[PDB]
């Protein structure tokens, strides 16, 4: 079922014409979590079913759009326009196996289109019932968006980071740790004229619930003081990634620096520990300040990494889950041999269904494949 869905989705997206005239012609779809120009809504019938412990309809597929994503933009409109072709294959899949549970396509733009149609979840409309669901952060999405990694979070705890930016750094580190799974290994270090571990681990750990809790509790107790020294910190980070005496993953050695700014590039350390660019370096500039952000971007660009800015709590959610786009380039380039179904851990369904396991298969973009034009 997953393979057929992925094939149909790729074929439909390949032959699609971009447009910006959604005012004249509207996209018709049923939206969940409800009850604007360019969109028409659908009123379902919502019969009651015995398999799903709620009311569902077998005539169209519901769409969930997160709160911060406005459903009137042209990207979302095009997404709905070209994803409206998955309903027929959804119906065929459910007709083949009537015992089929939820089928879902989670887009990279934020919206998740699932079948059968059913209203989103709510708990008595209490004030503490805001919908913060984001399909791009669900583990069944992250496990198929990339491969296991060997992340080592390097945190700036120098004196120039005390204040709002230190709190932002702590929150960002917690949200970054929230994206990891059991197959990934992580450790957290800090540096202020001296690099040291933030907890009792001293090396990479399997990053399960207990270890992640320990790391979060250790990172929520750090203080800012002393001068900054990027050379010692990066030496420590590269040394901890060359252990091989412990259990590891050996799949993605990445260094995720959290800082504000500086004037040090430290070319010698990078030319010493990775001449062959075997370790990616992602860089984050956190808070509102007036420090130079040049060397940070140079570090992000020289190594096959990326550079991000997190100026407020609002951007933490989105600007900490974007590194999976960079880590997915080799998988896309491999292409056909990377179309393998993966099954995830046991977790509680967000639509009140119990304990479930989710199959996973990514979908590639193949527009202009027979002409080899863009490839960007």
């Amino acid at each position: 079922a997953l393979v057929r869905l992925a094939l149909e989705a790729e074929k439909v997206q390949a032959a699609h014409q971009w447009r910006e005239d959604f005012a004249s012609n509207e996209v018709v779809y049923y939206n969940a979590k409800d009850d604007e120009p360019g969109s028409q809504r659908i009123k379902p019938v919502f019969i009651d079913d015995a398999n799903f412990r709620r009311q569902v309809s077998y005539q169209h597929a519901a769409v969930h759009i997160p709160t911060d994503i406005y459903e009137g933009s042209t990207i979302v409109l095009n997404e709905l326009n070209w994803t409206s072709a998955l309903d027929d294959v959804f119906k065929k899949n459910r007709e083949e196996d009537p015992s089929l549970l939820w089928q879902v396509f989670g887009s990279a733009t934020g919206l998740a289109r699932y079948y059968p149609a059913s209203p989103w979840v709510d708990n008595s409309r209490t004030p503490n019932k805001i919908d913060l669901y984001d399909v791009r952060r669900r583990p069944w999405y992250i496990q198929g968006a990339a491969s296991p990694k060997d992340m080592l979070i390097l945190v700036d705890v120098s004196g120039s980071v005390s204040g709002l930016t230190l709190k932002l750094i702590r929150t960002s580190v917690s949200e970054m740790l929230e994206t990891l799974s059991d197959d990934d290994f992580v450790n957290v270090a800090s540096f202020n004229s001296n690099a040291q571990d933030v907890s009792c681990f001293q090396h990479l750990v399997q990053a399960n619930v207990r270890n992640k809790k320990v790391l979060k509790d250790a990172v929520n107790n750090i203080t800012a003081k002393g001068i900054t020294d990027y050379k010692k910190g990066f030496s420590f980070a590269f040394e901890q990634l060359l252990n091989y005496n412990v259990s590891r993953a050996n799949c993605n050695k990445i260094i995720m620096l959290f800082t504000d700014g500086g004037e040090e590039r430290a070319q010698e350390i990078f030319a010493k520990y990775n001449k062959d660019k075997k370790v990616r370096v992602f860089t984050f500039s956190v808070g509102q300040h007036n420090y130079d952000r040049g060397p940070i971007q140079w570090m992000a660009c020289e190594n096959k990494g990326y550079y991000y800015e997190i100026p407020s709590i609002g951007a933490i959610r989105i600007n900490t889950q974007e590194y999976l786009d960079v880590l997915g380039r080799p998988m896309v380039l491999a292409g056909d041999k990377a179309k393998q179904v993966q099954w995830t851990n046991v977790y509680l369904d967000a639509l009140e269904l119990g304990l479930v396991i989710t199959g996973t298969l990514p979908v590639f973009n193949i527009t202009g494949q027979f002409e080899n034009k863009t490839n960007l």
């Binding site: 491969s147 296991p148 075997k278 550079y307 960079v326 880590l327 080799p330 960007l376």
Partner: peptide, 21 residues
Amino acid sequence: PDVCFDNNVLEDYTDCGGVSG
């Protein structure tokens, strides 16, 4: 798991987050 995908030589990686703004 044994299957790992990383470090493909055809990767562009010319679009970091700094030089593009």
